[PDB]
Amino acid sequence: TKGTTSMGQRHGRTHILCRRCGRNSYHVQWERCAACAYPRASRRRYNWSVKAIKRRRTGTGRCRYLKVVNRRIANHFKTPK
Amino acid sequence: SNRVTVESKDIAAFNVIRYPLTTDKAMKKIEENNTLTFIVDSRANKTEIKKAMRKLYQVKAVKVNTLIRPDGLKKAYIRLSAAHDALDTANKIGL
Amino acid sequence: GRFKPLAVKKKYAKKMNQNKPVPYWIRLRTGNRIKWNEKRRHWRRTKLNY
Amino acid sequence: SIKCGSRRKARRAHFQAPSHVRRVLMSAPLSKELRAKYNVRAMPVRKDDEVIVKRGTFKGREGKVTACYRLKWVILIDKVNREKANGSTVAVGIHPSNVEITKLKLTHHRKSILERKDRS
Amino acid sequence: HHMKIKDLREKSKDDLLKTLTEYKKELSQLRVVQQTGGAETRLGRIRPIRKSIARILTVLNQNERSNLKMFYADRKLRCKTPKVLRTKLTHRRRLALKENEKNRKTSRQMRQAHKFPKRVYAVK
Amino acid sequence: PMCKTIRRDPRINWIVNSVHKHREQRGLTSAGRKHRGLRHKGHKASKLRPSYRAAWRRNNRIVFLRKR
RNA sequence: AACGUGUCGCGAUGGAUGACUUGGCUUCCUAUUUCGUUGAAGAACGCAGUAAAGUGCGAUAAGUGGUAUCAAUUGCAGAAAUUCAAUUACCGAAUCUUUGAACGCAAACGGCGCAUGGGAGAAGCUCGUGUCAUCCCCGUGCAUGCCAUAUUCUCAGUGUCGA
RNA sequence: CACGAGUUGUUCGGAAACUGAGCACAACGUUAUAUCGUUUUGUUAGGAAAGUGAAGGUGUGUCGCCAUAACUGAAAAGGGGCAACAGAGAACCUGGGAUUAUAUUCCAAAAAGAAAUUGCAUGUGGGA
RNA sequence: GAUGUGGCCUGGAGGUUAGGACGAAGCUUAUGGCGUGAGCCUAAGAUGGACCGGCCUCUAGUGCAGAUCUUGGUUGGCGUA
RNA sequence: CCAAAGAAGGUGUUAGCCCAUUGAGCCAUAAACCUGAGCGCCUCAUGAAAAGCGAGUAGCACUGUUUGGGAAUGCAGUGUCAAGUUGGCAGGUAUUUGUCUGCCAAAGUUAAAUACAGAGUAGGAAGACCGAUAGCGAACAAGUAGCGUGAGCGA
RNA sequence: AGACCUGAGUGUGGCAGGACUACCCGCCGAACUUAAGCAUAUUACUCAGCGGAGGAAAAGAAAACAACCGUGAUUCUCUCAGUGAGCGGCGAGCGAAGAGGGAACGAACUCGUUGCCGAAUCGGGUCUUACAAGGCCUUGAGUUGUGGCACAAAU
Ligand SMILES: [K+]
Ligand SMILES: [K+]
Ligand SMILES: [K+]
Ligand SMILES: [Mg+2]
Ligand SMILES: [Mg+2]
Ligand SMILES: [Mg+2]
Ligand SMILES: [Mg+2]
Ligand SMILES: [Mg+2]
Ligand SMILES: [Mg+2]
Ligand SMILES: [Mg+2]
Ligand SMILES: [Mg+2]
Ligand SMILES: [Mg+2]
Ligand SMILES: [Mg+2]
Ligand SMILES: [Mg+2]
Ligand SMILES: [Mg+2]
Ligand SMILES: [Mg+2]
Ligand SMILES: [Mg+2]
Ligand SMILES: [Mg+2]
Ligand SMILES: [Mg+2]
Ligand SMILES: [Mg+2]
Ligand SMILES: [Mg+2]
Ligand SMILES: [Mg+2]
Ligand SMILES: [Mg+2]
Ligand SMILES: [Mg+2]
Ligand SMILES: [Mg+2]
Ligand SMILES: [Mg+2]
Ligand SMILES: [Mg+2]
Ligand SMILES: [Mg+2]
Ligand SMILES: [Mg+2]
Ligand SMILES: [Mg+2]
Ligand SMILES: [Mg+2]
Ligand SMILES: [Mg+2]
Ligand SMILES: [Mg+2]
Ligand SMILES: [Mg+2]
Ligand SMILES: [Mg+2]
Ligand SMILES: [Mg+2]
Ligand SMILES: [Mg+2]
Ligand SMILES: [Mg+2]
Ligand SMILES: [Mg+2]
Ligand SMILES: [Mg+2]
Ligand SMILES: [Mg+2]
Ligand SMILES: [Mg+2]
Ligand SMILES: [Mg+2]
Ligand SMILES: [Mg+2]
Ligand SMILES: [Mg+2]
Ligand SMILES: [Mg+2]
Ligand SMILES: [Mg+2]
Ligand SMILES: [Mg+2]
Ligand SMILES: [Mg+2]
Ligand SMILES: [Mg+2]
Ligand SMILES: [Mg+2]
Ligand SMILES: [Mg+2]
Ligand SMILES: [Mg+2]
Ligand SMILES: [Mg+2]
Ligand SMILES: [Mg+2]
Ligand SMILES: [Mg+2]
Ligand SMILES: [Mg+2]
Ligand SMILES: [Mg+2]
């Protein structure tokens, strides 16, 4: 019946890891991610979940180049004479 | 060319082969099978491993067997030619 | 089973490498707050599902 | 300029100070003879300096600085020590503001610092 | 061991490559020693050798980039300059109007500017 | 915007500026101004200027003067 | 008697309270303050003598270069004062792995190409050299669309003419 | 729980490299909005998506025609891909005293050995 | 249900007076005194180890016994099923 | 004993004189910025001494929507659609006439006062705010551990 | 033969793509709710959705107010004004604009057209230290019109 017995009927997996966000939200059969909409060029962003936006926005990661370019802007692109 | 970095041909062998292994299985293979054991680059193949062995330790590898370990490192089982002694070159390496 | 893609194998390898106790000399450092790893994972408690 | 109107900001600037700011904060007064001959009131302590404890239990103890830890905000002095339970000798840390510099370890850079500092 | 930055800067490219090769060989030997136990005094030499390798490669790359920026300075080459050698600035700053283009005026505007210049004046 | 003739011509020089990217998407063209009601001034467009949103903010934000 | 009931003194369990706050929230101000195909933001792997997380960084990997400082860092170990090797701060010079708008083609593949430069080559050829077939490695270019352009490139049309 | 180890391939499974139920990049159209629709009934797109090269001419080498480089082309309708670890396809199989843990994956000159298959080359033997 | 109270209590702010390493707040009580009461004060800690009291005014996230209240802890049932 | 410094941080108890701080001032400097539109040289520019002006547009009609806009404030679709020789638009009750006022649509660029109602960079100033069940979910290796197939949830 | 027009294919030089999105601009667009029921109305031209830029955006230089003794681009502030305006099952409720005191402001310009000219234009090479607002050369674009002079702040 439904319940415990049917829990052992659940085989396979609907989602695997996503190449773009790595969230285990990539629908294998539809070949699209439930979290970042990959392989669509733009990502999922919805104002009904501002919490998710803050979870995914700029600054939550590394900003490898953003810090460098911010420092260069703050120093007015100083270069040697 | 859009790449302006200075990349030399005398260093690739040092990157291909990282360091030998000292474990009991490696020692048994040295003693019995004329085989050296190295941790190598995970993006490397057997042909470049043969070339790196030739350029680094001046020995001929008749066979190279590789595996990627459960910890992410690629191992290399490198059997030398019968004209080269694995124990001698292992002493030369410092193993 | 036997099959896994290499990317998944490397993720599993990294998770295997992270599954270590804290070194003892960490606890002796000045101003240290770390006692246990507290991110230790057991294969029978929580699933990575890669 | 660590001290400011906001105590939170002043304490944060003090206890998260970098190593060189910590060096400046860990200054000790010079002796009256050194004040007379250099016209400087205080200098950051340095290894191999000769200091005398003015405040604390070890007041009057005189020795040579062996370490300026700067992470524990203390300086280690050779003559200031105690035995452990094992009986082995361990160095007792002293805040530099509790000691007084009697002899300076002089280098060309420290001479330039002294010339920057002197009030004459 | 340790390589002085001035000594590296005085050396030639071939000597720089040879020094890099020898330091890489030393680092490989030290990795081997790091595997088979080895004295802590030996293992203290790994970081200096890695930093010397980094110093040699920094000198090589700075010399190469300066030479290539010199080679493409001529207007015959300057249109073919590799993107990696051109100035970065910012995407918008690269695409923005330069001051020369921004300040362009019509002949009517220039004649008006000359005919009625802005004055400096005072009132008592 | 990248053509030299455009960038060096004072008449059309303005459109190279970054504030005019996709100005049709923000309704800044003549047809956009038409359907925004910017064809009229004074009493025909009091609630339309500078935009409906701007006038709505003017007329609906609650003002709290410091001393009141 | 015993269970049990009180009261007091002392213990235990349990972490309230009070003090202390490198945190939060709120308000205000300054300015040569606003990312990315010259590859961003996000993802992922890795890097220390010792190193799980975190931080920092990218095979030059808890950092290279330069400028200021002026003798540390610090759990242990290792090394050991005028720029030249300390350590901190800052930044002009550099590095910057796999990806990702991701863009040669794909992808639960660390896969497979086409051109063009290289590299290594124990067969063969040539006198241990040099050269080097298959195989292998690396760099660059190669999405689509659009604009301009061709010292005036190659074309198509029972379009309009002209020879 | 702690420490130290262990997974070896020309032939095994996958990919390289097949099509299927199907998917949907391009293209076109639609939509205020592409994050929509069409996209195998031989098959995209009002749609010029072939960059290949039969025979010729010219030149090189090989012989007594063949191969190689160029100019003129016969022919070829219907763009690019993915989707099967049970369909298609697929050249290795025994012995071992070869492990603590891998093996149709390790074994070295008497390979314990016996093979099968690719790619490229050198001679041999025959033809151009 | 209304109202009054030189009516009590709490965290901050202007003032003003004090107190504290010869022990501050917190905490404990067969620990007494005062008040009709809200409470206030003293005493003792064989408690604590650094802040803080009174009065006038200003201010508010200002008083708990219960909301099948919230969180944390404990608990008889029970050495039982 | 200082004070042109009493400034509020640190140091083993409550510190103007133990330390750091709290000034005038000194040194250095890619460009950009400011200064007889700073000051020279070459080059290059440069000053004065009759006609008609925005057409599927504006209007009208119908329908929708929006507005305080009410015989219709603005806009949209479709229909059909001008005038400029006495022109056109506006003058908040529809129509037809006159007379007056303003103004000259259907092309374009423009600083500053204004916003920042869950942004960001580099710095500052703070507060009659909260004081670890409070204040941000997060004073801690917190969007972390953990949960869900997933969107998400979340100490 | 060739030319023009209309379309292709390659080389060369560029740009777009995503992120952020608190404010700002365009579209799209609810319901809970209130009306003590509820359908117009309200919430609200709001939330959610789609697209776009900046350091601010948008607006801005009268086809504007007004009816004055007149004012004079835009934006914003106080007031106008919760209004003896006005819109509303004229219910619940909505609801502005002139003027006046101010902030800011060197604030003004550019096309098209009409007259007079007519390649005087623009890209490429190349030389002046120079991808010069320069000189020479170039059918290469361009006469199916680039550019110059004048138009009320003019004469
Ligand atoms: K002062
Ligand atoms: K002190
Ligand atoms: K209409
Ligand atoms: Mg089932
Ligand atoms: Mg399924
Ligand atoms: Mg988006
Ligand atoms: Mg294998
Ligand atoms: Mg299985
Ligand atoms: Mg289970
Ligand atoms: Mg799995
Ligand atoms: Mg002083
Ligand atoms: Mg107004
Ligand atoms: Mg780590
Ligand atoms: Mg490198
Ligand atoms: Mg790709
Ligand atoms: Mg793509
Ligand atoms: Mg024809
Ligand atoms: Mg275990
Ligand atoms: Mg282990
Ligand atoms: Mg589609
Ligand atoms: Mg069909
Ligand atoms: Mg099919
Ligand atoms: Mg068709
Ligand atoms: Mg397939
Ligand atoms: Mg099969
Ligand atoms: Mg197989
Ligand atoms: Mg087994
Ligand atoms: Mg074998
Ligand atoms: Mg009562
Ligand atoms: Mg309070
Ligand atoms: Mg009692
Ligand atoms: Mg309350
Ligand atoms: Mg209570
Ligand atoms: Mg019990
Ligand atoms: Mg103090
Ligand atoms: Mg001047
Ligand atoms: Mg007009
Ligand atoms: Mg019309
Ligand atoms: Mg309405
Ligand atoms: Mg505008
Ligand atoms: Mg801001
Ligand atoms: Mg909390
Ligand atoms: Mg919480
Ligand atoms: Mg965008
Ligand atoms: Mg509500
Ligand atoms: Mg109702
Ligand atoms: Mg009701
Ligand atoms: Mg109802
Ligand atoms: Mg409304
Ligand atoms: Mg919205
Ligand atoms: Mg932006
Ligand atoms: Mg603007
Ligand atoms: Mg006005
Ligand atoms: Mg009034
Ligand atoms: Mg009134
Ligand atoms: Mg309304
Ligand atoms: Mg006014
Ligand atoms: Mg013209």
Side-chain angles (χ1 to χ4, degrees), chain A residues 2-81, chain B residues 1-6 8-30 33-87 89-95, chain C, chain D residues 1-32 34-47 49-82 84-120, chain E residues 1-6 8-13 16-73 75-98 100-124, chain F residues 1-8 10-68:
Chain A
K2 71 205 171 194
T4 304
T5 294
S6 294
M7 296 293 164
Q9 295 275 291
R10 309 191 172 183
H11 312 135
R13 56 196 296 163
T14 303
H15 302 88
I16 58 183
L17 293 170
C18 175
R19 278 198 296 269
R20 191 153 82 182
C21 64
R23 257 206 63 83
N24 196 93
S25 304
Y26 193 80
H27 199 291
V28 199
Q29 195 164 351
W30 298 342
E31 292 162 338
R32 70 109 184 86
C33 179
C36 69
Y38 180 78
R40 188 177 77 198
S42 73
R43 306 213 180 186
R44 282 174 77 263
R45 186 186 164 103
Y46 294 111
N47 296 311
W48 45 259
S49 204
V50 171
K51 188 176 294 201
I53 295 177
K54 305 298 190 186
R55 222 124 54 183
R56 296 185 293 253
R57 62 191 274 255
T58 302
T60 66
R62 193 166 158 185
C63 293
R64 309 180 63 161
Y65 174 82
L66 249 189
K67 300 178 307 184
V68 170
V69 69
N70 287 335
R71 187 227 309 147
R72 301 293 288 109
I73 299 168
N75 289 89
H76 319 289
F77 295 95
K78 178 188 291 169
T79 216
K81 184 169 51 55
Chain B
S1 183
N2 206 36
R3 279 215 69 83
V4 304
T5 53
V6 184
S8 45
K9 322 126 60 183
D10 307 57
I11 312 303
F14 295 124
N15 190 272
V16 167
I17 302 177
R18 301 284 165 93
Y19 48 81
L21 280 187
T22 79
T23 69
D24 286 334
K25 186 163 186 176
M27 295 305 170
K28 288 224 304 181
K29 290 198 180 306
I30 298 177
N33 302 128
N34 205 36
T35 297
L36 295 160
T37 296
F38 295 94
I39 289 298
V40 291
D41 183 54
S42 307
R43 323 297 283 249
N45 64 338
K46 300 173 178 180
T47 308
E48 293 309 311
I49 289 178
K50 283 186 178 66
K51 299 176 180 186
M53 284 298 291
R54 174 181 194 174
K55 200 185 177 65
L56 291 178
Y57 310 108
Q58 296 79 41
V59 289
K60 186 187 202 290
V62 291
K63 204 189 196 319
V64 173
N65 281 21
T66 66
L67 53 87
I68 301 178
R69 284 138 52 92
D71 58 23
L73 305 182
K74 183 183 283 178
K75 198 195 314 186
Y77 290 119
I78 305 174
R79 172 183 267 266
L80 307 183
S81 170
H84 301 107
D85 186 69
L87 192 42
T89 181
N91 290 124
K92 254 60 92 194
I93 284 172
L95 173 58
Chain C
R2 171 197 137 264
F3 157 70
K4 66 229 56 165
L6 182 51
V8 163
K9 184 181 183 187
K10 293 211 311 181
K11 289 191 66 68
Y12 270 134
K14 182 194 184 72
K15 280 296 176 300
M16 220 174 311
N17 290 333
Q18 291 179 311
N19 219 14
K20 304 288 187 51
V22 187
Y24 73 98
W25 56 268
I26 293 290
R27 329 265 284 275
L28 304 184
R29 298 178 314 167
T30 289
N32 176 77
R33 319 187 77 265
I34 299 174
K35 289 291 145 299
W36 322 287
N37 184 19
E38 103 169 355
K39 281 190 178 185
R40 292 299 294 275
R41 169 193 55 87
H42 195 251
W43 60 274
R44 224 172 186 173
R45 286 193 284 104
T46 296
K47 295 301 187 176
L48 296 169
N49 301 316
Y50 296 150
Chain D
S1 72
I2 303 198
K3 166 149 61 59
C4 53
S6 170
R7 170 175 233 261
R8 177 186 175 177
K9 177 172 174 295
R11 280 174 57 83
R12 186 177 69 246
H14 180 89
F15 291 114
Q16 300 176 193
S19 189
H20 71 280
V21 177
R22 281 165 172 258
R23 183 201 85 100
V24 167
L25 295 180
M26 293 166 59
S27 305
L30 302 170
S31 61
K32 281 176 175 294
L34 286 189
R35 287 182 175 172
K37 88 147 301 178
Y38 284 117
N39 216 129
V40 183
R41 194 157 192 87
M43 282 290 290
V45 204
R46 197 196 158 286
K47 193 201 286 79
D49 276 2
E50 299 273 338
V51 293
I52 177 173
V53 196
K54 306 302 293 297
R55 185 169 171 264
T57 299
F58 297 99
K59 58 165 75 163
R61 198 71 53 81
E62 195 154 302
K64 178 167 56 70
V65 182
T66 62
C68 300
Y69 217 101
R70 290 202 207 166
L71 187 57
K72 300 200 270 268
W73 296 100
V74 292
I75 57 172
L76 303 176
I77 307 163
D78 59 358
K79 218 62 60 176
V80 179
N81 54 82
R82 61 171 300 127
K84 309 169 53 64
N86 273 7
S88 43
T89 304
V90 72
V92 173
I94 313 290
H95 198 266
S97 63
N98 295 323
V99 312
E100 171 192 307
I101 296 180
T102 71
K103 197 193 190 311
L104 291 162
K105 166 75 174 189
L106 283 176
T107 158
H108 172 268
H109 290 318
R110 219 175 180 199
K111 297 177 199 178
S112 57
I113 300 163
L114 283 173
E115 298 176 44
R116 283 157 33 195
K117 297 294 252 59
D118 82 309
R119 281 86 56 94
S120 303
Chain E
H1 210 72
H2 179 103
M3 278 257 64
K4 330 292 289 180
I5 185 60
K6 172 170 52 57
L8 293 180
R9 291 194 188 285
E10 295 197 54
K11 291 154 84 77
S12 45
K13 181 165 185 173
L16 275 167
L17 294 174
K18 164 178 48 58
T19 319
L20 174 60
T21 308
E22 74 180 14
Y23 269 82
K24 291 287 188 181
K25 186 171 195 168
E26 289 189 10
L27 181 59
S28 309
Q29 298 174 2
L30 282 191
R31 297 305 186 186
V32 182
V33 176
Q34 192 176 19
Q35 288 301 135
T36 80
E40 289 281 30
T41 67
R42 301 283 308 278
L43 287 190
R45 294 287 85 201
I46 293 178
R47 165 138 42 187
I49 294 181
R50 302 200 312 116
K51 298 317 165 194
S52 301
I53 289 170
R55 210 168 293 109
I56 293 173
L57 286 163
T58 297
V59 166
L60 277 165
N61 279 327
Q62 289 173 348
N63 287 347
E64 181 84 18
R65 289 205 58 162
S66 293
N67 296 336
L68 291 185
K69 289 176 176 294
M70 281 287 293
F71 170 74
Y72 289 107
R75 304 180 307 278
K76 298 297 167 293
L77 296 322
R78 199 224 62 206
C79 56
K80 301 299 185 186
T81 301
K83 304 284 182 57
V84 80
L85 286 171
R86 315 187 188 177
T87 173
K88 196 79 166 68
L89 287 174
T90 246
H91 172 94
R92 217 184 305 160
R93 292 194 188 274
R94 289 199 310 272
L95 290 202
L97 284 172
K98 272 63 252 168
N100 180 273
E101 294 164 328
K102 179 206 305 171
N103 299 335
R104 293 301 180 101
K105 303 182 182 308
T106 64
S107 47
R108 162 83 171 184
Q109 283 172 337
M110 288 160 53
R111 185 176 50 256
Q112 279 297 320
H114 300 161
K115 192 175 306 196
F116 302 101
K118 286 305 195 305
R119 303 304 301 265
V120 175
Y121 55 88
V123 198
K124 298 184 294 293
Chain F
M2 297 290 110
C3 177
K4 286 200 191 299
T5 307
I6 297 300
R7 296 174 71 94
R8 299 205 285 248
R11 283 90 190 193
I12 201 53
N13 200 243
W14 55 272
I15 209 158
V16 178
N17 292 321
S18 213
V19 81
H20 303 104
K21 276 183 302 194
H22 291 132
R23 54 191 292 265
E24 69 287 350
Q25 311 301 327
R26 289 173 290 131
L28 283 345
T29 64
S30 201
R33 294 177 54 83
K34 207 285 172 295
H35 75 71
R36 290 160 70 197
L38 294 178
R39 289 279 197 277
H40 296 99
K41 297 180 177 182
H43 71 289
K44 302 303 197 62
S46 54
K47 226 173 298 301
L48 292 60
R49 292 187 160 274
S51 62
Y52 273 107
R53 219 290 187 273
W56 187 91
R57 300 232 89 154
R58 265 203 325 274
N59 295 327
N60 285 278
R61 67 180 162 242
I62 304 299
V63 172
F64 295 94
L65 285 180
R66 236 162 43 101
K67 303 173 185 185
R68 61 183 193 269

